[PDB]
Design a protein around this ligand. Structure first.
Ligand SMILES: [K+]
Ligand SMILES: [K+]
Ligand SMILES: [K+]
Ligand SMILES: [K+]
Ligand SMILES: [K+]
Ligand SMILES: [K+]
Ligand SMILES: [Zn+2]
Ligand SMILES: [Zn+2]
Ligand SMILES: [Zn+2]
Ligand SMILES: [Zn+2]
Ligand SMILES: [Zn+2]
Ligand SMILES: [Zn+2]
Ligand SMILES: [Zn+2]
Ligand SMILES: [Zn+2]
Ligand SMILES: [Zn+2]
Ligand SMILES: [Zn+2]
Ligand SMILES: [Zn+2]
Ligand SMILES: [Zn+2]
Lengths: 69, 69, 69, 68, 69, 68
């Protein structure tokens, strides 16, 4: 409801368990891989080659399998 | 008009009421489902497949039925 | 001027006076209605169906008739 | 180099002289008229019909005649 | 680095040496001229007609000839 | 916290890694990071350009990079 009390445990949960995710950007582009790390501004997506991904360019994050906290 | 004094009760009603909402993104992509939770930056949209949506990517939130503030 | 010291008087007038407005979004979509309420982050636009509109996705708010501020 | 130290005087001058301005939106649309007023977030652009333009939506402000 | 400890010196020097830069906006438009002045939020781009350019709508600023600091 | 973003960007800059830099509008840039601050990255090549971070979508390095 305020702060990152959902965004942060959601992303660490998806980090801690090596869940495959789809990352859609605002430009439409879809990324896939595993979330190595993240801070307030960026995410490290691990795949073939890996990518640091600015959260401001993120529309959605869709885990490959249902997750919880 | 101060702070999230509309955005927070509005969306909290939707989560509490579990109303179907359509979420329209700034890029012209349509999301549909129900709001499981929210914080200052994101909204968990629930559906057959479930997504996390960064607010900054959303243009309008459009419920399925009338909601009273 | 200073802060949002122009935005709210403009919006609160449009709300208190039930003025039909046209809200334009940065993606080039047009929305039409009357401003039910607002806060720092969103606007509640009513008409056919109601909807919450993120301000960061708006470019212009154009009244259907002139107003004094 | 900080604050709105160039924006404030540029905008406040433009209003005080009521120079016709063209405002170009990030989405490529062109709005036009006079700056009647402004704050940290928006610019009131009067014309046939007046409108509130969010600053974040603007790409460029391009006056008709030079300001000083 | 921290803060504006590269941006401010870079645009300042472009201002001083009066380098004709080319400013590409996120929307793909190239606005070519010289930097009279800037503050935290805008660049003023002198040319045949001068114009205020909101920095948040900037993608890149490319100098005509390489520069130092 | 930028306890990832800054070191990561330091490491491409320290070891001088060729990088691709995709812009939110879908253009790819490419070169090496000479320097950065909170707002910009200075991308080096035959064309030296300053890049605003708000414009960047993904930074993709050419080869594997680890962050001690
Ligand atoms: K944490
Ligand atoms: K779990
Ligand atoms: K209710
Ligand atoms: K009125
Ligand atoms: K003047
Ligand atoms: K290394
Ligand atoms: Zn966080
Ligand atoms: Zn960012
Ligand atoms: Zn909130
Ligand atoms: Zn955001
Ligand atoms: Zn306000
Ligand atoms: Zn917002
Ligand atoms: Zn100001
Ligand atoms: Zn804004
Ligand atoms: Zn600065
Ligand atoms: Zn701005
Ligand atoms: Zn940093
Ligand atoms: Zn920026």
């Amino acid at each position: 409801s305020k702060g990152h009390s959902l965004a942060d445990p959601y992303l660490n949960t998806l980090r801690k368990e090596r869940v495959p995710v789809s990352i859609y950007l605002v430009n439409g582009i879809k990324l896939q891989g595993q979330i190595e790390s993240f801070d307030q501004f960026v995410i490290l997506l691990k795949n073939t080659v890996s990518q640091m991904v600015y959260k401001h360019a993120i529309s959605t994050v869709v885990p490959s399998r249902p997750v919880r906290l």
